[PDB]
Amino acid sequence: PIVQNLQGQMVHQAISPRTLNAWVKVVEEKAFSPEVIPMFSALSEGATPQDLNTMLNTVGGHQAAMQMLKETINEEAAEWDRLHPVHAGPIAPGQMREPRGSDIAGTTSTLQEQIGWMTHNPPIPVGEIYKRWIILGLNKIVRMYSPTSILDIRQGPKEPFRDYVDRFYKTLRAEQASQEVKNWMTETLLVQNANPDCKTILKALGPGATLEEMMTACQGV
Amino acid sequence: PIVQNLQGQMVHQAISPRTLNAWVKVVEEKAFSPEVIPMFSALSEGATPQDLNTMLNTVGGHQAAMQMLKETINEEAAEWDRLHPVHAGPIAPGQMREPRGSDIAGTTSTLQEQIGWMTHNPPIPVGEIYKRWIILGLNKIVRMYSPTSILDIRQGPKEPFRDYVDRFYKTLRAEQASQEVKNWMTETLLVQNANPDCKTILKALGPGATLEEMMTACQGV
Amino acid sequence: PIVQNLQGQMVHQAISPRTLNAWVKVVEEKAFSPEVIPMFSALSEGATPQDLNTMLNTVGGHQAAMQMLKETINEEAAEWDRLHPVHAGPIAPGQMREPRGSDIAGTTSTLQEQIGWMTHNPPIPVGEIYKRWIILGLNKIVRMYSPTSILDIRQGPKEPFRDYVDRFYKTLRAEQASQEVKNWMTETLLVQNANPDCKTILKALGPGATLEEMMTACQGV
Amino acid sequence: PIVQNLQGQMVHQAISPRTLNAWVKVVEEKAFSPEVIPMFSALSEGATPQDLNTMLNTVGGHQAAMQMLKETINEEAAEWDRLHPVHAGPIAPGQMREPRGSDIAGTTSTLQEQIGWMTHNPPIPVGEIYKRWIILGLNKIVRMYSPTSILDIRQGPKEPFRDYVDRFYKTLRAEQASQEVKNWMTETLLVQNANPDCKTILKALGPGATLEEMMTACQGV
Ligand SMILES: O=P(O)(O)O[C@H]1[C@H](OP(=O)(O)O)[C@@H](OP(=O)(O)O)[C@H](OP(=O)(O)O)[C@@H](OP(=O)(O)O)[C@H]1OP(=O)(O)O
């Protein structure tokens, strides 16, 4: 985080040990359930790339996943570097050097330049692009850790409908696809994969039946 | 939350990670018992739709209930959009764009727009209507998740009257009904289901007995 | 159709009997399989709306199909009327009047009027618009008359991959969801539903593989 | 096509509806078996590129086939542009301009232009060149849609030699390797894959035997 001192100049503030330990416990306990992404984005609000690096390195276990995240961050940094070629020439006192692909990731940047980049007007959000790369990696990790694809979620012969819907929507949350495909999956795959006992009821209800109506109608079975 | 900086400009503040973890734990332990709604409205005091979306997304299990909440929010947003038609024309410097139905939910807006909305005079409380929609959805979820119907709560042969009346009133709170049906239930169904030893005293007491009078009348057994 | 007589003046020419015979064979024997649309769009080459109605009377035998077609025509005519409000005022005597939603449909127009409309500089196409509305109706009918859903197209244990791909693409063309859902279906659902051996080869091939490579690699299995 | 009117001036004549109907039947029912090419080359007799595009829109139903066809057209157009650099300078007013790679394809040309191009002394054929590019695309598609490789065409225990030869030559015409490999296939692979009795007779006949003698000697076996 970045805060203003008494004089009003921006000063970095280290993350409290409570937040850091909460994030570490979330990563080590939850495996990589899909709710880690919102929790991470809530715990890392307006943080400098050094803070993100601390929040990532501090994790003790799940080292394979952190390695995959390292690979994804490196690929995104290389692509960004290719997109922005270096402008040769001395930097005027009124500006600062343009951050390269690895300057964003914090492997070759000091704290002061990172503070200066996004506190400048107009701002260049190093933190908000680094967090985008990290979240893009976490999406792949979460998708990998989820057991089964959405197309293989099937209600058992005896399973209650509420548990089946819970499994289906957990898997769909873990799924990686655009929003339109997710809407189609919600509309059709839910009815299509049900057990024979509830499939007839769901078809008889109609094509525009809301989730509440389906679950209250299939409550007994 | 909304806080002022040193200069006096409104600045968004992230929710405390302790509060967020407390809400997640509340949803973990309490399932969807009726006391969740006051807890939510206490933990989400004066929060922008960004914070509400964070607090809703962070929940890990019970994904079917969160999907019902999503559908209810969508219905309320569509009804709001129909109720307030779109106005065509350029935006004056002294005003801001009129929010649409999907604008209140925070899924198609920035945080700065909402900050300006809920601080500009006259206020347009996006947060205070999003919280209304969320509570409206949570009410249906709580009613549906009630483990047993009111008619099935009956005092046991050896159960003291305190336990039976507590179970009955908790179930009555969960199964939300109108006021007059609640009055009839309290007056008649409470007496009807009791064990014979308590039923005799309740009947002999009279029809217009308050809850305290019944509880202190049947205290001996 | 429209032809030029010996005096250089455009004159309507009726649809030859065997073209109507071919369209009647298409309607009565193809059972509204997804190939009715190309054959209609071929047989109706540059036809004035009177000829379009002459070809449409064949569908009048099927009550449900003709009802769907009439409803779609009327809805598109209403939308056309809404989007083109009739201008009240003097018009240049060298120009023709304006086609109403019931005059582009040939219900209340005469043949000379449509001939003048089509043979104009610049031309105002009425036949093409009417044909687009008819094709919308036929798309709806073909979607209704589909024999199986896209999620039920599964390759047999020993069916060649080419037959399965042709069946899948025919069903996907009948169902006609949006474009993005179609791309997702082609990329993922095609691989998912295949028989074990072809599924193994397609999985081992990799993700995001063009159809040519899939069919070439899975040729003799 | 191109016809001469009553004044002796070449005028374009549209493709009759039933020719387009026949081509649509060819596309939709033959499943791109190796006989689509002769029927296309027959139905497209002397057609200006506008008519070629009109016939090509039928293939637009098949996404993959149309993509392959479009790619081949574009590649050949690029090669044509490269091999015929546009000459900048004055031209004789009695001569027409030069057809670009996107003007021989009828995408950016008008009908009168192509009529003038084709009806020239000496003629500059645009229809024939466009048809050659289309046939290249169709060859690629037919090769993709083949049901079995040439090495898997084996005569059955009791299949007559004539049926086996016809199947073999159809598959060899689909696969369309170079000419020398085709001659080697015909000479050797045909004898190699035959059933034991016909293989014995063909071996005993000798090497370098014409097809007529092979089929005459192996008639009733
Ligand atoms: O080769 P042809 O003897 O000229 O056959 C054609 C051909 O029929 P088939 O391919 O079924 O044999 C036409 O079919 P299209 O592919 O053009 O559709 C068909 O026209 P219809 O489509 O109208 O059936 C026409 O039949 P018709 O005589 O009714 O015009 C018929 O010609 P023949 O009947 O003279 O064989």
Residue numbers in the entry:
A (entry chain L), B (entry chain M), C (entry chain A), D (entry chain A): 1 to 221
What do the paper's sentences say?
The HIV-1 capsid is a fullerene cone made of quasi-equivalent hexamers and pentamers of the viral CA protein. Twelve CA pentamers occupy sharp points of curvature—termed declinations—exactly 12 of which are required for the capsid to completely close. Here, we identify a Thr-Val-Gly-Gly motif that modulates CA hexamer/pentamer switching by folding into a 310 helix in the pentamer and random coil in the hexamer.
We found that IP6-induced CLPs have a range of morphologies—capped tubes and cones—when assembled at pH 8, but are primarily conical at pH 6. Local refinement with imposed fivefold symmetry resulted in a high-quality map at a nominal resolution of 3.4 Å, in which the central pentamer and surrounding hexamers are well-defined. Thus, our structure indicates that IP6 contacts with Arg18 also directly stabilize the CA hexamer, and contacts with both Arg18 and Lys25 stabilize the pentamer. Superposition of the HIV-1 CA subunits in the hexamer and pentamer allowed us to identify a putative switch in the NTD, comprising a Thr58-Val59-Gly60-Gly61 (TVGG) motif that adopts two alternative configurations—random coil in the hexamer, and 310 helix in the pentamer. These configurations are well-defined in our cryo-EM map. In the pentamer, the helix 3–helix 4 loop with the 310 helix configuration no longer interacts with helix 8 owing to repositioning of the CTD. In the hexamer state, the Met66 gate is partly buried in the hydrophobic core in a ‘closed’ configuration and becomes exposed in an ‘open’ configuration to avoid clashing with the folded 310 helix in the pentamer state.
